[PDB]
């Protein structure tokens, strides 16, 4: 495995840092296998096939939206089903309140998980479209996705 001479890596100033214009803290992570760095990006190929990627991303976003809507519909149907056997008996508001709270929390979780997935997808797309050489990717999952 190639190794970098310590003298030029960090010497106050860092000769490699000045040569490539990477901060020593960022350059340190690359050398010691802490974060990935982009060596080359194909701009010409990306431009010739950019709209297709936009459509392929939009289809996935729409699929996520449809799945979230279906999950919300199913959970709402369950909510309306659990109010039939609990309203026949003349109980107090506590018996009804628990179901209402559980359903509301389920709706909130179903919505926010989908929102997080959409945000992650948008982050992936934005990182890809702005990708440039000498760019440090610190997240392993994001790099695998890319």
């Amino acid at each position: 495995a190639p190794v970098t001479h310590i003298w030029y890596f960090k010497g106050v100033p860092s000769r490699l840092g000045y040569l490539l214009d990477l901060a020593p803290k960022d350059l340190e992570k690359i050398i010691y296998f802490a974060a990935y760095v982009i060596t080359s990006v194909d701009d010409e190929m990306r431009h010739n096939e950019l709209s297709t990627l936009e459509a392929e991303m939009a289809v996935e976003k729409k699929a996520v939206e449809d799945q979230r809507d279906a999950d919300l519909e199913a959970r709402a149907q369950k909510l309306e089903a659990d109010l039939a056997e609990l309203e026949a008996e003349g109980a107090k508001s506590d018996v009804r309140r628990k179901v209402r709270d559980s359903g509301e929390r389920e709706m909130r979780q179903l919505r926010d998980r989908a929102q997080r997935e959409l945000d992650r997808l948008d982050e992936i797309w934005n990182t890809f479209t702005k990708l440039a050489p000498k760019q440090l990717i610190v997240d392993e999952v994001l790099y695998r996705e890319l």
Binding site: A1, V3, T4, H5, I6, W7, F9, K10, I31, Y32, F33
Partner: protein
């Protein structure tokens, strides 16, 4: 110091030969880097050997 380098440099050659998972290979590469660094300048980056 030299000995350590050689040792690690040998272990890597084995790990790559039998196709170890990327995590172990990366760890071995990092160890080799640190060993070479300490050989040239001990105690510069991390705790001295």
């Amino acid at each position: 110091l030299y000995r350590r380098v050689i040792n690690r440099n040998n272990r890597l050659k084995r790990l790559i030969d039998l196709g170890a998972p990327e995590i172990i290979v990366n760890n071995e590469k990092r160890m080799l880097q640190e060993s070479v660094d300490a050989l040239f300048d001990n105690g510069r980056r991390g705790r001295p050997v």
